[PDB]
Design an enzyme around this catalytic site. Structure first.
Site, short mmCIF file in Angstrom:
data_model
loop_
_atom_site.label_atom_id
_atom_site.label_comp_id
_atom_site.label_asym_id
_atom_site.label_seq_id
_atom_site.Cartn_x
_atom_site.Cartn_y
_atom_site.Cartn_z
N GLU B 1 0.82 -1.21 0.00
CA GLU B 1 0.00 0.00 0.00
C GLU B 1 0.86 1.26 0.00
OE1 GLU B 1 -2.70 -0.19 3.23
OE2 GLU B 1 -3.79 -1.93 2.45
N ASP B 2 1.83 1.30 -0.91
CA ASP B 2 2.75 2.42 -1.01
C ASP B 2 3.51 2.62 0.31
OD1 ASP B 2 2.50 3.17 -3.69
OD2 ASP B 2 0.73 4.41 -3.29
#
Ligand SMILES: [Mg+2]
Ligand SMILES: [Zn+2]
Ligand SMILES: [Zn+2]
Ligand SMILES: [Zn+2]
Lengths: 47, 49, 263, 66, 45, 49, 113
Positions: B1-2
């Site tokens: 998620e980044d």
RNA sequence: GUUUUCGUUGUUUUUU
């Protein structure tokens, strides 16, 4: 307490050999700021 | 998620290590011909608050 | 059981054939050398004065990045261990650099050679700035221009790469085994075929290419590994290998000592 | 702005070779060729010096206050 | 008392909070203070 | 504030009740809030900032 | 500003031991070893050597969370061997193997030059 | 000796 606001350095411990200043000395225990780290740590008076 | 996972040692080698600079300003102010502000180290006996 | 066969050795590097040992053991020893090797690097950087164009902390950091001759780092104590008030020569070393550029034109390129072993727990061959060559000034340190002086006094202390990567003695340490994927420990991505699309390992010679009809042996295990022991120069690849082995050994001895003492 | 002391990735000391690397450049020797000369194989190393930007001189260009 | 220095001529001079702040030597209208007298450390990490 | 202590948990925009919850404290160093990766779905968020 | 100290990665605090034992009641002759100031380097090394032992029923370790210099292992040596003895056995075995490779490398470095 | 305080309103910018 007039023994504060003065240059203080450590003789023994985990940060042996670091300059610092004293800020708060409520009693029988000294809290010291350090120069290279932007942190202030406690330490007994005798070190 | 980044979420990013990095080489610790490279940062120990200062990779992507950046500077900061902050400039302040101050100046003595005039309340009048005879009343101004003064750059000093205040003693408690003289100044308050 | 363990075996060694140096393929290529050097001051900085040792490239050998380690076989008849475990994959886990080889990885653990590699980790031991890379991270668990105490070394000495510029730690306490202290400026009497400066005039250069760079941030004092920036210069200090670059100073810590300096490998120092650390042959006798085995001998000098950690600063924390020593009970002396402040440091002593037996728990830290004193170097100094002080460079000035004179002349209204030009630029004095300060070099690590300018760093000088002021003190140190003699006669320990430590605190000596590492250099490719004696004529090699070393790593470029600073550039001083007209009316730009530099005076500094630093203190280094023995430490481990785990504490900070500056203590990493090994510049790099590769690893491999079974280049032919005989153990089939990897699935080879490709569009047409892995073989014609993948290069060949430099150590491929040491192991024959598996035969076409050869049936897979699920009793096959990692036995022959391949290695090159680089050193950043503070120590020798052979000294690094031996000292990492000794550090692993001391850790195990301490562990078993705790096993007996706690009981 | 200056040459890094070490290679971020592996930690190979690189600052010393810069002046030598620059000398290699002086004669227009091909980037890859010069890199090869310096015995800098790992592109983890090659990358910085291949695209390292040095700008300390621009600070020296500025007239120092003293 | 306190040590200052000019930005243009590069000369140190000391005022005592009484002289109007002007360069004592080249009239440059911008002065500065100097380094402190205490020692500095750096962890170099 | 001791570990495991129940505490509130609120993210924006709070479109629906699942947008917020309460959690048990688990203090660690470093200055970010650490979340079990499943909680994200109702929070519909990633680590892009 | 909340980041932990780097030097503590290897410093063991005095009050805590380097190692901590705990028997595993859930299955016979199974213990639990709580670790401090250690990582895969020692964990995997000891684990593999022990797993090569025949007198071990179960053995497995894991690091609870990377941020903390402490992990755990659950050993179960079969009835005859209590886990601690097989552990020290693996310790001595790795000691001797490492010393063997050490002398071998000494010899090979000496001859190569 | 305990004790003990800094402004607003706007603007523009981005932050998802
Ligand atoms: Mg976003
Ligand atoms: Zn000492
Ligand atoms: Zn590299
Ligand atoms: Zn002037």
């Amino acid at each position: 307490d007039p023994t504060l606001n003065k240059t203080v350095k450590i003789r023994q411990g985990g940060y042996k050999g670091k300059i610092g200043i004293v800020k708060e000395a409520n009693g029988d225990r000294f809290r010291v700021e350090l120069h290279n780290p932007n942190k202030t740590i406690p330490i007994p008076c005798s070190f | 998620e980044d979420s990013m996972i990095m080489n610790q040692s490279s940062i120990d080698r200062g990779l992507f290590r950046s500077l900061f600079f902050r400039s302040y300003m101050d100046q003595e102010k005039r309340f009048g011909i005879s009343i101004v502000e003064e750059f000093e180290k205040p003693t408690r006996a003289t100044t308050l608050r | 059981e363990p075996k060694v066969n140096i393929i290529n050795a050097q001051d900085d590097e040792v490239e050998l054939m380690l076989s008849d040992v475990n994959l886990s053991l080889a990885n653990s020893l590699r980790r031991t050398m890379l991270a668990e090797v105490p070394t000495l690097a510029i730690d306490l950087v202290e400026i009497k004065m400066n005039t250069s164009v760079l941030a004092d902390e920036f210069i200090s950091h670059r100073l810590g990045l300096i490998p120092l001759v650390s042959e006798d780092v085995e001998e000098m104590k950690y600063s924390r261990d020593c009970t002396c008030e402040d440091y002593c020569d037996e728990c830290s070393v004193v170097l100094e650099l002080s460079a000035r550029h004179e002349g209204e034109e030009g630029t004095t390129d300060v070099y690590s050679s300018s760093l000088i072993k002021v003190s140190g727990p003699g006669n320990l061959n430590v605190g000596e700035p590492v250099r490719r060559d004696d004529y090699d000034q070393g790593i470029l340190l600073c550039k001083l221009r007209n009316h730009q002086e530099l005076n500094i006094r630093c203190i280094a202390k023995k430490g481990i790469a785990k504490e900070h990567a500056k203590w990493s003695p090994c510049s790099a340490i590769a690893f491999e085994y079974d280049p032919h994927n005989k153990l089939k420990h990897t699935d080879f991505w490709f569009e047409v075929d892995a073989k014609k699309e993948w290069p060949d390992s430099k150590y491929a010679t040491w192991e024959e290419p598996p035969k076409p009809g050869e049936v897979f042996d699920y009793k096959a295990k990692p036995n022959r590994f391949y290695m090159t022991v680089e050193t950043t120069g503070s120590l020798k690849a052979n000294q690094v290998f031996s000292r990492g082995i000794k550090t692993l050994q001391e850790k195990l001895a301490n562990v078993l000592f705790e096993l007996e003492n706690s009981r | 702005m200056i040459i890094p002391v070490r290679c971020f990735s592996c930690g190979k000391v690189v600052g010393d070779k810069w002046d030598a690397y620059l000398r290699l450049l002086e004669e227009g020797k091909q980037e890859g060729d010069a890199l090869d000369e310096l015995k800098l194989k790992r592109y983890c190393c090659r990358r910085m010096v291949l695209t390292h930007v040095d700008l300390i001189e621009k600070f020296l260009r500025y007239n120092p206050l003293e | 008392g306190v040590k200052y220095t000019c930005g243009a001529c590069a000369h140190n001079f000391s005022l005592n909070k009484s002289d109007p702040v002007r360069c004592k030597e080249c009239g440059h209208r911008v002065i500065y203070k100097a380094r402190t007298k205490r020692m500095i450390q750096f962890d170099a990490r | 504030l001791m570990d495991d202590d129940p505490v509130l948990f609120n993210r924006q925009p709070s479109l629906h009740k699942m947008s917020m919850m309460a959690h048990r404290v688990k203090v660690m160093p470093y200055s970010t809030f650490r979340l079990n990766l499943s909680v994200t779905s109702p929070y519909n968020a990633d680590f892009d900032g | 500003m909340n980041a932990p100290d780097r030097f503590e990665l290897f410093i063991l605090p005095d009050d805590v031991p380097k190692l901590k034992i705990t028997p595993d009641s859930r299955v016979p002759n199974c213990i639990i070893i709580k670790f401090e100031r250690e990582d895969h380097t020692l964990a995997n090394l000891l684990r593999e050597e022990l797993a090569l032992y025949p007198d071990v029923t179960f053995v497995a370790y894991k690091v609870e969370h990377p941020l903390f210099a402490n992990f755990v292992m659950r050993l179960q040596t079969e009835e005859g061997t209590r886990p601690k003895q097989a552990l020290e056995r693996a310790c001595a075995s790795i000691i001797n193997k490492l010393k063997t490779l050490d002398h071998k490398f000494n010899e090979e470095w000496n001859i190569k030059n």
